[PDB]
Amino acid sequence: RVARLEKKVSALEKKVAXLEKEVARLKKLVGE
Amino acid sequence: RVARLEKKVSALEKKVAXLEKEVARLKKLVGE
Amino acid sequence: RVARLEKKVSALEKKVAXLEKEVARLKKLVGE
Ligand SMILES: *C(=O)c1ccc(NC(C)=O)cc1
Ligand SMILES: *C(=O)c1ccc(NC(C)=O)cc1
Ligand SMILES: *C(=O)c1ccc(NC(C)=O)cc1
Ligand SMILES: *C(=O)c1ccc(NC(C)=O)cc1
Ligand SMILES: *C(=O)c1ccc(NC(C)=O)cc1
């Protein structure tokens, strides 16, 4: 169960890093 | 401890999935 | 290993909370 969790958490880290980059780009595209 | 972590990870997966879908839709609306 | 996963999951939770705030703003500006 911990080895499986480690792999799910690594997959989440890679998806969140990306979303952060895509959201940063969208924020620039949309503007203020 | 591991059961509680499994619950937290499943909740994060459900939030990341969605964010991915919302981001995809926003990308289309910006012209990518 | 368990403490290391708890650290990583906490970090992810605070990055996903945010992404949800910034995606909520983008969706409001583009949608309305
Ligand atoms: C949990 O991810 C976990 C628990 C047990 C094992 N392996 C064996 C042989 O029991 C892998 C992973
Ligand atoms: C951690 O989430 C954890 C550790 C032990 C137990 N024990 C039992 C018997 O349920 C639950 C959860
Ligand atoms: C889409 O945004 C999407 C589709 C399915 C799920 N599933 C669950 C269980 O939340 C999340 C998000
Ligand atoms: C897991 O994150 C983990 C496991 C063991 C230890 N330290 C000792 C002394 O057992 C730290 C962290
Ligand atoms: C986001 O949910 C968030 C982040 C920081 C703060 N800070 C204060 C002091 O209210 C509120 C909400």
User: Distances from the Cα of B4 to the Cαs of A5, A20, C2, in angstroms?
Assistant: 11, 26, 11
Question: Structure resolution in Å?
Answer: 1.4
Into how many domains does chain C fold?
A: 1
Smallest Cα–Cα separation from C19: which of B9, B7, B12, A32?
B12
Give B-chain residues touching C30 at CB under 8 angstroms: 26, 29-30
Technique used by the depositors: X-ray
Q: What are phi and psi of C19, to 5 degrees?
A: -60, -45
Smallest-distance ligand from the CA of C17? 5
Q: C16: how many CB neighbours lie within 10 A of its CB?
A: 19
Q: What is the C-alpha separation between B8 and B31, in angstroms, rounded? A: 35
Tell me the torsion sign for CA atoms A17, C9, B8, C25. negative
Contacts of B26 (CB under 8 A, 6+ apart): A26, C23, C26, C27, C30
Question: C11 CB near a chain B CB, below 8 Å?
Answer: no
Q: For residue A3, give its domain range.
A: 1-17+19-32
Element at B31 (helix H, strand E): none
Q: Do C13 and B12 touch (CB under 8 A)?
A: yes
Q: Which of A23, C18, A16 is nearest to B17 (CA)?
A: A16
